[PDB]
Amino acid sequence: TIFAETWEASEYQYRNKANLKTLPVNHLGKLAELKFDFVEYKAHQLIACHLYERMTIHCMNQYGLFKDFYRPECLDAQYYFKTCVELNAAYGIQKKFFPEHFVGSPYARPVPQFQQLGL
């Protein structure tokens, strides 16, 4: 689990595998595409995947779930939120049981003890 608002991108990139995905920060630009009026505090937009969650709520309050929620600004928020928590759940597990896969980990390329050098 991430216990902060900011994380180093390199810490979630692989060292011995091709990097085909990143763990990007929240897309604050999607928040300006909501046409209706809403109240959002800047203190909640950086934490991972929560912005897309609040946006989905704002859109599900203004509109419902039938024939009015089906607009591009609201479906992309629901899709982002659902996708953000799935990717973060997998990255979090991979960080817990496979920390050696990521850059910055001292086990990705272990540095040997001085007793192994024969000096």
Partner: protein
């Protein structure tokens, strides 16, 4: 022998909900007209699938709809470095051959999977366990050699590595157990008897006030006079707490030609 209908058919009660995501007047008016005549219209297409008939997805005008792919900074340049930022645009611009290639899996997630070992290798494992629980381990040598011989070597390597992984996960789970079951200084000597008869709701906003001034009407009747007096009292307490301050430590990252420590960043620049 009626065809089977999915749960979504009972939400809409029709196979022809003309759902178009494009929010232009020309599109939504035509859909409402088309949504009404779908019963007697030959140019009608389904969007709710069934056992007897497949269906189409969400419509985008005359084309089809798909959400914007989740932002992914991975890209591949062809002519010049574009410095693609997936957060700089709302909708992802198309990939031009001479400009950029995006990462694979526009709509993809990260999962963990496993290969299925060969069937004959599985049967040798079933026979070993069966002979194990029946006759015991010491009388399963023939069944053990059949595994090492029939199972291809790539499978024996997987079996060898599965044990090392679960051994790793076993330790990672027990270390969390140790940190979790550790008794902190603020809970020394406390047991279930010292616990309060409270539930989750008792820590919410209705019962437990948040640490903000405008969460409720607590400080709504405060005047500037009461403030000036409070500023004097807090400064009085600071006459006894400001006496102490941590000493400045040495900068471990003083040398720029040295791998710096990923030390916690300051709150402010």
């Amino acid at each position: 022998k009626a065809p089977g209908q999915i749960y979504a058919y009972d939400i809409h009660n029709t196979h022809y909900p003309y759902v178009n995501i494009k929010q232009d007047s020309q599109t939504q008016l035509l859909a409402s007209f088309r949504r009404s005549i779908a019963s007697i219209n030959p140019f009608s297409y389904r969007q709710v699938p069934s056992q007897d008939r497949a269906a189409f997805g969400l419509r985008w005008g005359n084309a089809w709809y798909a959400p914007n792919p989740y932002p992914n900074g991975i890209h591949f340049d062809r002519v010049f470095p574009t410095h693609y930022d997936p957060l700089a645009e709302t909708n992802r611009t198309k990939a031009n051959l001479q400009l950029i290639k995006y990462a694979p899996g526009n709509y993809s997630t990260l999962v963990v999977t496993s290969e299925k070992l060969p069937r004959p290798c599985i049967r040798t494992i079933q026979n070993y366990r069966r002979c194990q629980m029946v006759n015991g381990t010491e009388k399963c040598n023939s069944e053990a050699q059949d595994i090492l011989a029939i199972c291809p070597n790539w499978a024996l390597d997987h079996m060898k590595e599965k044990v090392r992984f679960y051994t790793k996960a076993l330790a990672i789970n027990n270390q969390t157990y140790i940190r979790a079951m550790q008794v902190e200084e603020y809970n020394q000597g406390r047991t279930v008897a010292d616990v309060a008869p409270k539930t989750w709701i008792h820590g919410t906003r209705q019962h437990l006030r948040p640490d903000t001034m405008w969460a409720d009407d607590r400080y709504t009747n405060i005047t500037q006079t009461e403030i000036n007096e409070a500023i004097k009292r807090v400064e009085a307490r600071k006459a006894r707490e400001h006496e102490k301050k941590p000493v400045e430590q040495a900068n471990v990252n003083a040398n720029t030609g040295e791998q710096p420590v990923r030390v916690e960043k300051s709150l402010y620049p």
